[PDB]
Scaffold this active site. Structure first.
Site, PDB file in Angstrom:
ATOM      1  N   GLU A 121       4.716 -11.586  -2.669  1.00  0.00           N
ATOM      2  CA  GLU A 121       3.872 -11.299  -3.824  1.00  0.00           C
ATOM      3  C   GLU A 121       4.584 -11.599  -5.145  1.00  0.00           C
ATOM      4  O   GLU A 121       4.154 -12.471  -5.902  1.00  0.00           O
ATOM      5  CB  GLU A 121       3.384  -9.848  -3.789  1.00  0.00           C
ATOM      6  CG  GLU A 121       2.243  -9.558  -4.753  1.00  0.00           C
ATOM      7  CD  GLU A 121       2.728  -9.102  -6.112  1.00  0.00           C
ATOM      8  OE1 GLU A 121       3.799  -8.464  -6.174  1.00  0.00           O
ATOM      9  OE2 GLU A 121       2.047  -9.393  -7.118  1.00  0.00           O
ATOM     10  N   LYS A 149      -0.071   7.233  12.688  1.00  0.00           N
ATOM     11  CA  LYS A 149       0.357   6.962  14.053  1.00  0.00           C
ATOM     12  C   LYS A 149       1.860   7.111  14.228  1.00  0.00           C
ATOM     13  O   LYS A 149       2.647   6.590  13.436  1.00  0.00           O
ATOM     14  CB  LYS A 149      -0.047   5.552  14.483  1.00  0.00           C
ATOM     15  CG  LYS A 149       0.172   5.304  15.968  1.00  0.00           C
ATOM     16  CD  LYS A 149       0.958   4.031  16.214  1.00  0.00           C
ATOM     17  CE  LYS A 149       1.132   3.769  17.703  1.00  0.00           C
ATOM     18  NZ  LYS A 149      -0.072   3.133  18.308  1.00  0.00           N
ATOM     19  N   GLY A 182       1.876   2.318  -5.063  1.00  0.00           N
ATOM     20  CA  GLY A 182       3.324   2.368  -5.116  1.00  0.00           C
ATOM     21  C   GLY A 182       4.015   2.117  -3.790  1.00  0.00           C
ATOM     22  O   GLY A 182       5.027   2.747  -3.485  1.00  0.00           O
ATOM     23  N   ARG A 224      -8.266  -0.620  10.428  1.00  0.00           N
ATOM     24  CA  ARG A 224      -8.844  -1.410  11.512  1.00  0.00           C
ATOM     25  C   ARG A 224      -9.764  -2.519  10.995  1.00  0.00           C
ATOM     26  O   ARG A 224      -9.847  -3.596  11.589  1.00  0.00           O
ATOM     27  CB  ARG A 224      -9.583  -0.504  12.499  1.00  0.00           C
ATOM     28  CG  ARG A 224      -8.658   0.417  13.288  1.00  0.00           C
ATOM     29  CD  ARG A 224      -9.361   1.011  14.493  1.00  0.00           C
ATOM     30  NE  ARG A 224      -9.752   2.403  14.286  1.00  0.00           N
ATOM     31  CZ  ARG A 224      -9.201   3.434  14.918  1.00  0.00           C
ATOM     32  NH1 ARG A 224      -8.238   3.232  15.807  1.00  0.00           N
ATOM     33  NH2 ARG A 224      -9.619   4.668  14.669  1.00  0.00           N
ATOM     34  N   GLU A 225     -10.447  -2.248   9.886  1.00  0.00           N
ATOM     35  CA  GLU A 225     -11.286  -3.240   9.214  1.00  0.00           C
ATOM     36  C   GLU A 225     -10.460  -4.435   8.751  1.00  0.00           C
ATOM     37  O   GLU A 225     -10.976  -5.539   8.568  1.00  0.00           O
ATOM     38  CB  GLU A 225     -12.028  -2.613   8.028  1.00  0.00           C
ATOM     39  CG  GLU A 225     -13.035  -1.542   8.413  1.00  0.00           C
ATOM     40  CD  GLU A 225     -14.144  -2.067   9.309  1.00  0.00           C
ATOM     41  OE1 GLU A 225     -14.485  -3.266   9.214  1.00  0.00           O
ATOM     42  OE2 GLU A 225     -14.681  -1.271  10.108  1.00  0.00           O
TER      43      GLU A 225
HETATM   44  N1  LIG Z   1       4.207   1.826 -17.945  1.00  0.00           N
HETATM   45  C1  LIG Z   1       3.413   2.383 -16.998  1.00  0.00           C
HETATM   46  N2  LIG Z   1       2.623   3.445 -17.273  1.00  0.00           N
HETATM   47  C2  LIG Z   1       1.831   4.007 -16.339  1.00  0.00           C
HETATM   48  N3  LIG Z   1       1.752   3.568 -15.071  1.00  0.00           N
HETATM   49  C3  LIG Z   1       2.489   2.507 -14.660  1.00  0.00           C
HETATM   50  C4  LIG Z   1       3.381   1.841 -15.621  1.00  0.00           C
HETATM   51  N4  LIG Z   1       3.984   0.836 -14.959  1.00  0.00           N
HETATM   52  C5  LIG Z   1       3.522   0.857 -13.683  1.00  0.00           C
HETATM   53  N5  LIG Z   1       2.634   1.854 -13.506  1.00  0.00           N
HETATM   54  C6  LIG Z   1       1.923   2.177 -12.245  1.00  0.00           C
HETATM   55  O1  LIG Z   1       2.821   2.113 -11.136  1.00  0.00           O
HETATM   56  C7  LIG Z   1       2.148   1.573  -9.997  1.00  0.00           C
HETATM   57  C8  LIG Z   1       3.046   0.591  -9.255  1.00  0.00           C
HETATM   58  O2  LIG Z   1       2.618   0.513  -7.899  1.00  0.00           O
HETATM   59  P1  LIG Z   1       3.074  -0.682  -6.918  1.00  0.00           P
HETATM   60  O3  LIG Z   1       4.411  -0.327  -6.313  1.00  0.00           O
HETATM   61  O4  LIG Z   1       2.893  -1.992  -7.648  1.00  0.00           O
HETATM   62  O5  LIG Z   1       1.930  -0.561  -5.785  1.00  0.00           O
HETATM   63  P2  LIG Z   1       1.669  -1.693  -4.670  1.00  0.00           P
HETATM   64  O6  LIG Z   1       2.977  -1.778  -3.923  1.00  0.00           O
HETATM   65  O7  LIG Z   1       0.521  -1.127  -3.870  1.00  0.00           O
HETATM   66  O8  LIG Z   1       1.316  -2.935  -5.453  1.00  0.00           O
HETATM   67  C9  LIG Z   1       0.878   0.898 -10.497  1.00  0.00           C
HETATM   68  O9  LIG Z   1      -0.263   1.486  -9.867  1.00  0.00           O
HETATM   69  C10 LIG Z   1       0.822   1.163 -11.988  1.00  0.00           C
HETATM   70  O10 LIG Z   1      -0.455   1.691 -12.358  1.00  0.00           O
HETATM   71 MG   LIG Z   2       2.912  -4.762  -4.391  1.00  0.00          MG
END
Ligand SMILES: Nc1ncnc2c1ncn2[C@@H]1O[C@H](COP(=O)(O)OP(=O)(O)O)[C@@H](O)[C@H]1O
Ligand SMILES: [Mg+2]
Ligand SMILES: Nc1ncnc2c1ncn2[C@@H]1O[C@H](COP(=O)(O)OP(=O)(O)O)[C@@H](O)[C@H]1O
Ligand SMILES: Nc1ncnc2c1ncn2[C@@H]1O[C@H](COP(=O)(O)OP(=O)(O)O)[C@@H](O)[C@H]1O
Ligand SMILES: Nc1ncnc2c1ncn2[C@@H]1O[C@H](COP(=O)(O)OP(=O)(O)O)[C@@H](O)[C@H]1O
Ligand SMILES: [Mg+2]
Ligand SMILES: [Mg+2]
Ligand SMILES: [Mg+2]
Ligand SMILES: [Sr+2]
Ligand SMILES: [Sr+2]
Lengths: 425, 412, 425, 412
Positions: free
Chosen positions: B223, B389, B197, B354-355
């Site tokens: 993205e 950090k 998230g 770091r990786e």
């Molecule tokens: N309808 C839903 N039910 C359950 N989980 C959800 C649903 N829609 C989105 N998600 C969860 O919300 C998260 C969105 O994270 P995101 O902001 O995309 O992370 P990142 O920025 O790392 O890509 C996802 O991991 C997804 O599993």
């Molecule tokens: Mg993303």
């Protein structure tokens, strides 16, 4: 400080094929041309293309020239001779643009010195310099305010609201996957990634068959891996449920043949277009997909598989080439306004882990492909690994990336004999 | 283009009255003088103020003892009225400003003459034009006296403000408490595993910034589409799950909420650019223009690995590290906080990052996101924001609430 | 066999800015020019620069031309237009030199054939060929006999002998370090290397403060990392001993403010010049440091930090870029005849070793930087690692490289709150 | 440019008298003849000497039996007096020398015509000019008869010399005993960890060489300044510690010692070039000229890793290995021992050096330096010089004294 030979080819390539014009219009503007001769030609064709569109001719162009009185023509034909390929066209457009930008910068410098030698307000000159450099910077894609984007999004929500469909967009044919994935929407890139022999080529065939049969919609496949005959022969085995190994070996019963013949008739009813050309450049696939989209109306396109594709210009690191191919495929999907599905293969390290199923990291090994694939599907066959699990005959489809919903897994039936995927119960 | 006599009269007028010198010091400085002799006499006269205020000819001799007395006496004869002086000071400054412009003109010609990708040329040309426009002088060095006074004024503003945060607030109180806030000219990195998230957390930050602080923001989404991203935010605002939106499963009650959210979002100023692969140089050029034209006080990039340098480097880590440096330079130039998101290959820690190409060294602030329920147990509804950090010093951890369905972050 | 466009820019760049002349004189000589027109221009400017030095004008040049009668001028102005940047100037000088050398070699070949066809002594021809190739080789820096070098060294010993100073060269301000290091001498490169958060930025600030306050000497800092405001704000915290976190947060007492105001007054007394420009090329830093050295008289220059600097032309491997930057920095230090101190950051592997302090190997990881840094200092905070050691509040300065003496370590006090280094007792 | 008749008379004169052939053999060889027929007859006549000394026409027939008899008889008619013959032999040689020059001229034109860095062109041009100047013939192959005789003469010189060492002595007796010495055309590598005194050891070698052997030397110091280096040596000679020199801590008694050392050092011929980063090609060009002009019999490079190839290679080890090959080629060309110092990443051993880019394979001699007190115990004042590789065979170890303060090496 300028290059004519380049401008010569830019205008020429526009003359022979009109479609080339917009491509040039994206790259260049009337004033990157050093020659007034060329700026006029760029102007008249630019205007001509919109009015006449695709069917723009040479006599028609000449008549327009005469009515304007702009014309006084052999030179034009010579320019037409000078036409250059789409890939080279992109290359020469780039070099024209760089010269133009260089000229523009030097000119600003000259003016500022002149203005400087004269007596003018410092604030006025620098602000204008800021404006001028901004204009050069603009000449391409810009920033969008949320208010305009919000309006289009709401319209998209309306269309979803107003639909009678259980699944919006093109259905996969597999009920549980089709429901949770919500379907294949126009203008997005779908990635089916699995290790060799996991049945992704077969899964593609299942999708395209289900589309043609159930939804009555045409599809196109670029098969880089297997020939069109092998692809069709396998598909007949899927339809008739006659084992593929017997078909290829040549051992068949008269009853088996009749079943195969009938399957051939039914398949002939469906509209499916195949291109087995072994290694296509992204430019090649784009051209073919464009015309195939225009002549035949295809709502779905599959590419099998991704690694077999190559960029117009090869680079030394592998990952950059893949990442580039990916980026183009997404660009194509948007352009065609149809879902595009690309198949990808996974490296050895997938099976070196105790879990033995695919992960997002396994796909990364191939490049920064993931960044723009609107859905990512994995295929896994535990059975593939050994005889023992009493499970076998089943295959699992993992949903690593979704825009709509959380990560999920869908189990489906797979028959090794006929190489056919089917819904479980 | 300077006048010996016009400014020469400024020096004479300074010799005659010691109350004349602060007037010229307000208008002009030592650098504006064409002649070394004038600059030097200007220097000693300015320094004469601190350590006899009004000795008009014997500190002149005193300065000469530690360091052309007949010549300055000739200058003494040439002087003018105080109303006269303000005018001639103005003309000295403009001629000086003229030189700066002409110098810029020469440089700009040189840049065109060089051999680089035109984007680079445009980027480098913008930087020089902006710096000279700001400075009014070709030279970028500043004496600490000038910087110290500006710092003091800034300290006044920090003291007289009701904190909360002196920098830009995230909207999350406790996190904002541990961090001073997002200050101009620093690089913040939000790093987490896929699906933690971070994209949503960014949306929360920019939304809270726009609504409460009434401030404009910019996001480069490499993205996901601009449309795709926006729907997300509408989903966060209206608290309608994305799966319902897309499925067509939604109800009218849902809709109006989405429409209202659309109206409210349209009220806010937020600029989006979705370009699938941006070079860092493109991004600075675009951010350069966007900062000038619409004045955006915050910039978010999603995400880091998707960016690429003007010249490709080997193998990977150095290329990624290069991107980090570029973004830091961007933050410095635009004088606004820049936040870049990064993906990671118990909790997450610095070693994992770091990786990925050692970004930690160029970053002023590093944030991690962790969601223990995602791994899957024990009752939970929470996600934690870790600080690896901080320029200040200590690592600390902040819990916050996270709703799986709306993908929404909230204060507990 | 020759390039004019190149020679055009070489002469032009010399016309606009005189300072460019010597740079060209290092690279080229009168006779690398194919044109007599150019060789005359090269000759007159070369002579003109020495006589008039920096203040060489266009009217003044014209008057000199007229007195000589060499002149008969528009072409000269056109050449002036043709002026090219310092970096490009170096580039075009190089290509002019290569053509010249190529011509010279081919000419020797032609002559030898002619001489060969005629009848001449073999020994005479080959010796002359040896001499001619030697001359081409010379046209740059040569070998020095020990007798000449010995004389300068003795003079240096005299100056050290005749000095009333406890520490020759610029003192650091930290007594124990200053004594064993013997100080910062003109024309050498000092490297302060430590891991992030080890207080090297703060240590630099301590040095420059101590220099300005105690020795009454001006200093310059290029801060690539932090802005001039942050740098000054931190410094005020060091002076007034008001904690930095309170200053930035905005929580201060009226008593605390007055202390800060007074500190601002005292700091304003000192002469310190700051450049916060985020990424400088070596060419950029050199130009700025030159003029800053001329206009203001600075005896010390600090660059924070090294990795943020970049070469005029980027290379693919990282190490070559660093090593190049290092090499330039040492070259600058000599040129300016003042000590130059560059800060460097250490990679992760420093803390992966059980000793947890820096070593020479850790610096190598960044490139062949060490080869020419006349002193190398490391900073270490065991405390940084954890709460527990009852030691804390102390920091150690390690002396990895000295020209004068053996490897040694110096312990000093460090207050985290005010970010200030101080002498222990 | 050769004469059939002028040399043709040389062949005739050889036919007539068998005492004529050693006279021509002294002046000229088979290669100098323009015609295959003359070269062949010259060949058989020279070989006729060993295995009938004086049969003037029937060994001619004998040689023909195992291999134009009328034609040679025509040549027999054309002959000349012995005083005549020396003159015509001289003209045959000069015309031959002419051809060599013309050939060189053509080649030199070709080199200019090619596309390479001009330094490379100059380097390659020098090599061809020097080889032809030495050989007087375009071809570089030598028959073993000529090489064997020269070897024998060399063996005489080795036998008649009072050893000590047939090669250049280090100044350290025991080390010089185990090593034959430093011979012309081989590469010696001194490798040690930083601060093991390899720079000082080099200075000791070149000093001892200059003072005792009265021989000139050259040092390329890439690390430390020419001035910096020299002070070192003065510190070694006068035995005044560097810290005292610099500090200003020194006394007059110290000084005069330094001045005397300066006078004594000025007496010796030693050439220094400090160029911060040298390409190998630059170094050979410079060493090429320095060997010709001042005739230096020894060359030291400090240190190896600081050198770089004309074309950059990947990643590192191959680049370093390339440098080694270049230096070996330099040693071969200049016909003097070349010593390069190297830095290392119980005792030190060959494996540690291999990690550095495998120089051991191209090196004729490898020396390590180790100072057990530096690691720090037990009473000690000593440092050991190890031999990892010797073309002869066995690895052996030599102790020597090392004074920490003067950084001075001495025999026990
Ligand atoms: N309808 C839903 N039910 C359950 N989980 C959800 C649903 N829609 C989105 N998600 C969860 O919300 C998260 C969105 O994270 P995101 O902001 O995309 O992370 P990142 O920025 O790392 O890509 C996802 O991991 C997804 O599993
Ligand atoms: Mg993303
Ligand atoms: N010609 C064939 N005959 C028999 N079995 C096959 C044949 N082709 C594929 N299969 C089986 O079914 C699966 C088909 O997958 P495949 O078409 O190879 O997809 P992919 O392109 O991902 O390897 C394989 O795992 C294999 O076990
Ligand atoms: N703004 C700040 N507030 C509080 N503590 C700080 C601040 N800046 C630095 N420090 C502390 O003092 C030290 C300062 O070092 P720093 O200036 O970061 O040098 P470097 O550039 O080598 O990291 C850090 O280790 C940190 O613990
Ligand atoms: N005044 C001194 N007191 C003690 N040791 C010293 C003094 N001056 C120099 N040294 C030592 O002498 C050594 C010189 O070695 P050096 O020849 O520089 O080795 P390298 O050639 O490997 O760089 C250093 O290790 C240093 O510790
Ligand atoms: Mg397949
Ligand atoms: Mg720092
Ligand atoms: Mg050394
Ligand atoms: Sr005008
Ligand atoms: Sr002649």
């Amino acid at each position: 400080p300028c290059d004519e030979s380049a401008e010569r080819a830019v205008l020429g390539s526009m003359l022979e094929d009109p479609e080339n014009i917009p491509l040039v219009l994206e790259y260049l503007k009337e004033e990157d041309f050093c020659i007034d001769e060329h700026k006029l030609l760029f102007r008249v064709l630019t205007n001509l293309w919109s009015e006449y569109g695709n069917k723009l001719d040479f006599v028609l162009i000449k008549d327009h020239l005469e009515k304007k009185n702009l014309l006084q023509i052999d030179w034009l034909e010579e320019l037409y001779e000078e036409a250059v390929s789409p890939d080279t066209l992109e290359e020469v457009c780039k070099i024209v643009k760089q010269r133009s930008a260089q000229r523009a910068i030097i000119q600003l410098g000259i003016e500022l010195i002149h203005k400087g030698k004269e007596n003018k307000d410092f604030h006025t000159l620098i602000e204008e310099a800021q404006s001028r450099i901004f204009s050069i910077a603009e000449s391409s894609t810009q920033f969008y305010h949320v208010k305009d984007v919000a309006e289009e999004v709401i319209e998209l929500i309306y269309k979803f609201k107003s639909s009678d469909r259980l699944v919006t967009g093109l259905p996969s044919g597999f009920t549980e996957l089709d429901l949770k994935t919500t379907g294949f929407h126009p203008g997005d890139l779908i990635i089916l990634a699995a290790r060799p022999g996991m049945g992704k080529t077969a899964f593609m065939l299942s999708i395209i068959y289900n589309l043609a049969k159930d939804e009555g919609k045409p599809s196109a496949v670029f098969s880089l891996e297997m020939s069109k005959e092998q692809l069709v022969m396998r598909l007949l085995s899927m339809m008739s449920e006659v084992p593929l190994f017997k078909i290829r070996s040549g051992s068949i019963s008269n009853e088996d043949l009749k079943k195969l013949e009938a399957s051939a008739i039914e398949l002939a009813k469906y509209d499916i277009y195949l291109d087995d050309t072994p290694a296509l450049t992204t430019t090649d696939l784009r051209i073919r997909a464009r015309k195939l989209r225009k002549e035949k109306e295809v709502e779905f396109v599959a590419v099998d598989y991704l690694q077999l594709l190559r960029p117009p210009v090869r680079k030394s690191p592998r990952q950059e080439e893949v990442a580039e191919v990916s980026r183009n495929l997404k660009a194509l999907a948007k352009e065609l306004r149809i879902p595009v599905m690309a198949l990808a293969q996974l490296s050895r390290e997938v099976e070196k882990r105790s879990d033995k199923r695919p992960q997002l990291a396994d796909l990364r090994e191939s490049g920064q492909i993931e960044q723009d694939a609107d859905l990512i599907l994995f295929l896994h066959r535990p059975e593939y690994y050994t005889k023992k699990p009493n499970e076998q005959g089943i295959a699992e489809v993992i949903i690593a990336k979704q825009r709509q919903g959380p990560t999920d897994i869908v189990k489906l039936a797979f028959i090794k004999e006929y190489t056919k995927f089917a819904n479980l119960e």
